[PDB]
Amino acid sequence: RSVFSERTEESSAVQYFQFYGYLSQQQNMMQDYVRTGTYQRAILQNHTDFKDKIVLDVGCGSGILSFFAAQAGARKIYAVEASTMAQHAEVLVKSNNLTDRIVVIPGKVEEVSLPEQVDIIISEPMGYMLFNERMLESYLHAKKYLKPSGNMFPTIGDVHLAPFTDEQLYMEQFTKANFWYQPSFHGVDLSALRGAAVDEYFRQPVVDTFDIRILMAKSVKYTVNFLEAKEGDLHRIEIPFKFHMLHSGLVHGLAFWFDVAFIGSIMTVWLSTAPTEPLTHWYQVRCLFQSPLFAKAGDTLSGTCLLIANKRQSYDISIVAQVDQTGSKSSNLLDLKNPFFRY
Amino acid sequence: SVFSERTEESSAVQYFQFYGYLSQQQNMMQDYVRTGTYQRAILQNHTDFKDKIVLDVGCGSGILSFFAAQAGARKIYAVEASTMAQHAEVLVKSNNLTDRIVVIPGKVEEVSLPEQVDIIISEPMGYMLFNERMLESYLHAKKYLKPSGNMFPTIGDVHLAPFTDEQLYMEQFTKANFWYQPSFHGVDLSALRGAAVDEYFRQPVVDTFDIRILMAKSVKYTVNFLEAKEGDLHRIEIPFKFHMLHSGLVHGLAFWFDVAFIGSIMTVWLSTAPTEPLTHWYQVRCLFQSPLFAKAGDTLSGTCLLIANKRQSYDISIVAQVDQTGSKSSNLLDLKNPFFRY
Amino acid sequence: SVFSERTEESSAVQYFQFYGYLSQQQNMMQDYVRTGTYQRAILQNHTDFKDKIVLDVGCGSGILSFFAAQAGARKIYAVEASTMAQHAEVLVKSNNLTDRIVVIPGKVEEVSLPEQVDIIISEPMGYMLFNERMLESYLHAKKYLKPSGNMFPTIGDVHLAPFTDEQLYMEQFTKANFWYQPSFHGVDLSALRGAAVDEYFRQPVVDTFDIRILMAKSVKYTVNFLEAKEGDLHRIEIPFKFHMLHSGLVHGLAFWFDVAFIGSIMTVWLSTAPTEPLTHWYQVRCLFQSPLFAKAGDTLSGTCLLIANKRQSYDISIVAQVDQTGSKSSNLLDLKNPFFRYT
Amino acid sequence: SVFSERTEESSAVQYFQFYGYLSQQQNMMQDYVRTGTYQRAILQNHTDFKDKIVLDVGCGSGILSFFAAQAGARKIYAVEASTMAQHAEVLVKSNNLTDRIVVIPGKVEEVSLPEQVDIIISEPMGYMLFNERMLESYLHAKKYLKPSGNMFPTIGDVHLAPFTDEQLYMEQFTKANFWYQPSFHGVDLSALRGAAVDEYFRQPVVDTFDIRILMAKSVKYTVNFLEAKEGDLHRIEIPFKFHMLHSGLVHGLAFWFDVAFIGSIMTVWLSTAPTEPLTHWYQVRCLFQSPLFAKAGDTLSGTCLLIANKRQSYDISIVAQVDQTGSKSSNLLDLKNPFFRYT
Numbered sequence A: 001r002s003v004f005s006e007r008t009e010e011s012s013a014v015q016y017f018q019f020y021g022y023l024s025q026q027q028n029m030m031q032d033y034v035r036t037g038t039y040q041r042a043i044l045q046n047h048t049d050f051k052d053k054i055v056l057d058v059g060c061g062s063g064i065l066s067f068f069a070a071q072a073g074a075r076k077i078y079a080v081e082a083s084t085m086a087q088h089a090e091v092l093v094k095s096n097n098l099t100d101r102i103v104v105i106p107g108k109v110e111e112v113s114l115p116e117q118v119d120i121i122i123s124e125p126m127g128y129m130l131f132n133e134r135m136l137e138s139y140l141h142a143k144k145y146l147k148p149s150g151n152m153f154p155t156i157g158d159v160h161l162a163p164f165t166d167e168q169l170y171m172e173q174f175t176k177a178n179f180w181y182q183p184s185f186h187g188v189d190l191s192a193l194r195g196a197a198v199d200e201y202f203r204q205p206v207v208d209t210f211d212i213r214i215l216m217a218k219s220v221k222y223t224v225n226f227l228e229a230k231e232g233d234l235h236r237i238e239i240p241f242k243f244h245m246l247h248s249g250l251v252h253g254l255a256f257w258f259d260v261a262f263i264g265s266i267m268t269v270w271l272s273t274a275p276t277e278p279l280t281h282w283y284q285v286r287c288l289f290q291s292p293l294f295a296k297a298g299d300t301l302s303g304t305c306l307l308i309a310n311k312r313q314s315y316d317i318s319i320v321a322q323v324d325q326t327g328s329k330s331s332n333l334l335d336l337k338n339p340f341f342r343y
Numbered sequence B: 001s002v003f004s005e006r007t008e009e010s011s012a013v014q015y016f017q018f019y020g021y022l023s024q025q026q027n028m029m030q031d032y033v034r035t036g037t038y039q040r041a042i043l044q045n046h047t048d049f050k051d052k053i054v055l056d057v058g059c060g061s062g063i064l065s066f067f068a069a070q071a072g073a074r075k076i077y078a079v080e081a082s083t084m085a086q087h088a089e090v091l092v093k094s095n096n097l098t099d100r101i102v103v104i105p106g107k108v109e110e111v112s113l114p115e116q117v118d119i120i121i122s123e124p125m126g127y128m129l130f131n132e133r134m135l136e137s138y139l140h141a142k143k144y145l146k147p148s149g150n151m152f153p154t155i156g157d158v159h160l161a162p163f164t165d166e167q168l169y170m171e172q173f174t175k176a177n178f179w180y181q182p183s184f185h186g187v188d189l190s191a192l193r194g195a196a197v198d199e200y201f202r203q204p205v206v207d208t209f210d211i212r213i214l215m216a217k218s219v220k221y222t223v224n225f226l227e228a229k230e231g232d233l234h235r236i237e238i239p240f241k242f243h244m245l246h247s248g249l250v251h252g253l254a255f256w257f258d259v260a261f262i263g264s265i266m267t268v269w270l271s272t273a274p275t276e277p278l279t280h281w282y283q284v285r286c287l288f289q290s291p292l293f294a295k296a297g298d299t300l301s302g303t304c305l306l307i308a309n310k311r312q313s314y315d316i317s318i319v320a321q322v323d324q325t326g327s328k329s330s331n332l333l334d335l336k337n338p339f340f341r342y
Numbered sequence C, D: 001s002v003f004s005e006r007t008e009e010s011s012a013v014q015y016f017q018f019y020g021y022l023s024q025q026q027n028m029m030q031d032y033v034r035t036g037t038y039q040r041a042i043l044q045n046h047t048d049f050k051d052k053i054v055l056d057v058g059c060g061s062g063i064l065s066f067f068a069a070q071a072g073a074r075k076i077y078a079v080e081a082s083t084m085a086q087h088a089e090v091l092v093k094s095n096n097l098t099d100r101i102v103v104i105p106g107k108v109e110e111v112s113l114p115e116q117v118d119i120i121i122s123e124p125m126g127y128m129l130f131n132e133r134m135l136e137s138y139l140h141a142k143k144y145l146k147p148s149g150n151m152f153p154t155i156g157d158v159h160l161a162p163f164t165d166e167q168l169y170m171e172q173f174t175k176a177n178f179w180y181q182p183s184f185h186g187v188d189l190s191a192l193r194g195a196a197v198d199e200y201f202r203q204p205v206v207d208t209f210d211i212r213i214l215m216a217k218s219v220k221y222t223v224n225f226l227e228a229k230e231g232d233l234h235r236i237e238i239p240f241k242f243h244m245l246h247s248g249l250v251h252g253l254a255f256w257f258d259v260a261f262i263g264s265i266m267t268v269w270l271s272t273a274p275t276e277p278l279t280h281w282y283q284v285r286c287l288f289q290s291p292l293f294a295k296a297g298d299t300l301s302g303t304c305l306l307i308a309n310k311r312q313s314y315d316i317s318i319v320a321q322v323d324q325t326g327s328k329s330s331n332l333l334d335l336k337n338p339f340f341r342y343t
């Protein structure tokens, strides 16, 4: 039984790979110039890491990263993709006269057979909030094909978490559930479901961008080193935090973004999704507290963000947060698989 | 006395204490619409006052008696229960009108007058017209009115109209949601959120608003002071059927009133409607705890029931219904604890 | 089960997950044409419900059952297969109606009812009426209907008409021409342009539009739910012969539908036509691969063939020719994957 | 009852009506200085509470009792005379503390408490510390205090300082001069001007102010709640001799207060001084009838006599004199009828 199928509900995998089979989705991702230009720069400026080397491209989609590795001089690139996009990748490899160097291997990286070990693995394994889609585990799984000296592009990933204040976002989600307070919608009392409705809406992480002035403390960083991490490390991800509050006011939740670094032989190239940086198709992610916490400047906001992988290729998110000085505590559960796209 | 029988002593003490303050008198007198309109009603109907006997109920500083004197009254009995009666007597002497204005200290339900009067003047209107229950004292004073005497004001019109105001609703809704907190300094308050919502939404909101928030033609409820009895004001039932002109959320009902001075020379109107300059009565809005949705052309039907209480005010019951869909709203309000938002 | 034999498990999982969300219930309930017309149809035909036995197929939060209760029904069996069933149960208790509404979690093809019913109520219509294949569940439920029995809705009319929309047509190639460039970061993408075009044209466009784009009076295809059987919906052939009211280029066919509640006291209609206020069903347009020129008074004839698939939707095949000239066009579309264009 | 004999019914009615409102509880609870300081005082002196018996006098919604429970109190009697006692009970039940907090509706002068307590907690301070005459109920409750028990707060310090505020002084006459016109709609109002003036000057002004209007270091009058008897508060004679730090016109006296929680571990201070963040106690200013000129280095002497009355408040008689010149002034004010000037 493949490692992939054992961790993944089939109904989730069918939807997931159908979504990624669409050329329109490829175009959406490729037109992110920050993402595409930073990947090409990371590969081309570290060309010695690719010249005359064997490369594995995990989840290659249309194959763009494999074309970048070929531009950098790779001797051989195995491009693995499990969606039907694999067949379009083959078309581009032929139309670009790279049949001698790029070899598309359709299927899941956990189930294919690669002809040889590789010098470097390249991929775009990052989902929303970094961890969504559980692709990082496939990326890590692929290290079974990596030589001892081998490198990984990207090499590390940093998840950033910071408390924010945004009463408009909070009230927007809060009043959405207010529909269910009605004691007489067309004569029907709906209010018994108001609780369940508010929980539903607040379980959705909010995906959009925000002004960095809504952040109330320096971010906390949590780092995964892809060269050293193992698949199982991502089944349960525990991120403690202790924020030193820089402004007073209501904390409505935690904001999340991530950076990855391509640590090459010639230079390290960073790809950032921080709200201080140009927007990308990852945006940023915010998990709202069902009830905001009040904190004064100089207070400490401490707790834990716990991510439990689930069989729908995503994570159950638990956030418990505490204003230490007063003992005001907030607990929240979020379903990362189904965010609210607000942008 | 009729007054004491219907009034808790603690309420009456505070009430007449409030009206004893000259600053409160100044506040009402500086309302130029109020004072200029009353003077216009009296002076322009001077034939209803020339060489007549007048009763002024709750005269305060006495301004209306001075107006009656300017219009030619022969004798004016000015009745006032608060300590302001002594300041009014001071003004009568300083204005050399001791021969025409006779201040009688006391409650109009309790004092004695030496003769029947031709006309009664008063400012009995509180917030939403009925607050303070002064209209019953005004009506009670008709025991001193000659058989065809007049009353200034003569009639009163209460208007009510549904309104939409998401900001006002959310402001009160959000105040109450402080008690949703599961861990305020470590304490779960949420068990009291319902009670908080009740308390905040029982408060009539006294302020003014742009008329664009009104979603139907107002419905009018008329009290004819020449005809009504005290007891008519103990339980006031106001049915309403609104024909909706706009679609959206009805957050509550807005109230205002006009009074008419029906004199022999002219009728003169004093209006507190939102289409008119602001007065110290403002306008009053009763919020539904949950708004009702309605489309243009639906009818919004229900009843506003006012029951007088012994704190000189009213318990307000509003039941309303979108007839087409059966969406219903029931609400209770304490007119004596208004929220002054202006 | 009849439902499982016609439905891939992967499609059913996602389908019911979707209808488990209160936000989806909320969106449908806030469609005032939808909710208000159903209430009007039921209450104004109160003698079809007074002291009757009712079956509610796919009741969601249960609102149609509450309407049947407002109309005096003695017993209502409300069947719902998604997790929304648990929420309907809460509402039946909180509205003190456990004595009259019995919520039955499950597929109507799999549950058991204790007794036969006088009337079936349902909202089985999807996009283009037929999407979701819920009509078959509605018809299947007739095994529980008494010979006298009625159905609410009683009939459904699907309307087809030819439209001209130059801008909608050209948009497809503007999108696809993203791939028609020789050096996207060094890669020649042009070989995938044809596939990108093909992908866009297979999507029905869910949108509303101005009725002035219609070039001929609509043609109607009627399903009588009192007479139809499930298998009648596996292959739906809709012939058409449009008489062109205007000259121009025909870029596709527009779809909408009405249903009628044929009651003892009156017939009430729910219409999603572009001449009526917009509903959450919108309208649907299927483009032709190549536009067809027709002159006013010409005749545009052909067929729309809908073939049910196991993803709870239809493969759409449309063929059309202008009789006077012979110019012909086709198109194959996947109703399961509409393009939501509404703005 | 002691409370009955010192309080007119009309005043008591309105008083407990006012504190029956949850909006009033919310106002005080949302004062972070008030709420947070009480919490720190109790929590940071946990050895004063662990396994101890506690009396909470005038508990309102019950917050201090929950704090005493957080600190490990074995048992807490929470006494409240307003209808708010019913809401505190609800909160005790919802917080699963029925075993440790017992809510006693009624006046502390009239309830029966089952046993002596180790420590009394309360918030008995009104405007100017003494308004409302709650301190007497707090001291009366020491009939239930074990010998060697403690009081939280332990001491209260009222502060008096001379101030200059020309605009506040002139404002009285600008308001009264409304009456000084010969023909207000034809009526000569001028004979009431002097009465209007007198009315305004009887009112203490509740307001905050810039500390730069203060003309001398405050004089402090200390009540030690562990030693004082309730009779000590019936007549409070506060002598003062101010060493003027600035030259100018003295228009009246400013008042504020501090309280100290003198715990076994530490002492915590709650301050309403104008040098500190504003609280819902604000500050209080009593004008002299006429200003007194004083040079820096002069001494301003006199007395502030607070005479308790049956309206749960005080008559304030202030006499003051510039020693080096003999210039004297005075005023008599009704603390029950303050003018709230804050903007």
Ligand SMILES: COC(=O)c1cc(O)c2cc(NC(=O)NCCCCNC(=N)NCCC[C@H]3O[C@@H](n4cnc5c(N)ncnc54)[C@H](O)[C@@H]3O)ccc2c1
Binding pocket: A004, A016, A017, A020, A021, A029, A058, A059, A060, A061, A080, A081, A082, A083, A085, A107, A108, A109, A110, A124, A125, A126, A127, A128, A133, A135, A138, A281, A282, A337, A338, A339
């Ligand atoms: C209402 O509708 C929903 O409910 C819904 C829910 C969502 O949440 C929605 C979210 C949306 N966007 C989004 O997520 N934007 C973030 C940008 C990430 C862009 N891509 C990436 N970096 N992700 C990871 C790489 C993926 C590639 O790798 C392949 N691949 C995976 N696994 C394997 C394997 N084992 N073997 C071989 N190949 C594999 C796979 O096929 C791909 O080609 C949009 C619509 C959404 C709709």
Ligand SMILES: COC(=O)c1cc(O)c2cc(NC(=O)NCCCCNC(=N)NCCC[C@H]3O[C@@H](n4cnc5c(N)ncnc54)[C@H](O)[C@@H]3O)ccc2c1
Binding pocket: B003, B016, B019, B020, B028, B057, B058, B059, B060, B079, B080, B081, B082, B084, B106, B107, B108, B109, B123, B124, B125, B126, B127, B132, B134, B137, B280, B281, B336, B337, B338
């Ligand atoms: C819960 O927070 C509170 O504590 C609170 C509550 C309120 O609701 C608050 C409301 C506030 N303003 C307000 O109401 N503005 C509307 C303008 C009304 C303008 N005056 C009028 N038309 N009132 C009726 C006539 C009164 C005169 O008639 C005398 N009078 C009464 N009865 C008798 C009697 N039997 N015999 C002889 N004389 C009698 C009485 O002494 C007076 O001179 C402010 C603060 C408030 C504070």
Ligand SMILES: COC(=O)c1cc(O)c2cc(NC(=O)NCCCCNC(=N)NCCC[C@H]3O[C@@H](n4cnc5c(N)ncnc54)[C@H](O)[C@@H]3O)ccc2c1
Binding pocket: C003, C016, C019, C020, C028, C057, C058, C059, C060, C079, C080, C081, C082, C084, C106, C107, C108, C109, C123, C124, C125, C126, C127, C132, C134, C137, C280, C281, C336, C337, C338
């Ligand atoms: C990007 O992401 C996608 O890929 C995607 C694809 C879509 O196309 C998307 C399309 C979207 N809108 C849409 O569809 N708008 C029209 C809907 C009309 C309103 N709903 C109705 N009338 N449908 C039919 C009734 C259904 C009820 O009946 C229940 N039910 C079904 N079967 C059974 C059974 N056997 N037993 C018992 N109960 C059953 C079921 O649970 C329900 O409660 C939105 C998001 C979409 C997302």
Ligand SMILES: COC(=O)c1cc(O)c2cc(NC(=O)NCCCCNC(=N)NCCC[C@H]3O[C@@H](n4cnc5c(N)ncnc54)[C@H](O)[C@@H]3O)ccc2c1
Binding pocket: D003, D014, D016, D018, D019, D028, D057, D058, D059, D060, D079, D080, D081, D082, D084, D106, D107, D108, D109, D123, D124, D125, D126, D127, D131, D132, D134, D137, D280, D281, D335, D336, D337, D338
């Ligand atoms: C002239 O018009 C009036 O009439 C008037 C006069 C005023 O001056 C006005 C002043 C206003 N604001 C104000 O004061 N702002 C300062 C913040 C005070 C912050 N609260 C506090 N620390 N107060 C003392 C504790 C009270 C608690 O203790 C309870 N309690 C009392 N006695 C007993 C007893 N014997 N037994 C059991 N429980 C008892 C009581 O029920 C409470 O829960 C507003 C309206 C006012 C109206």
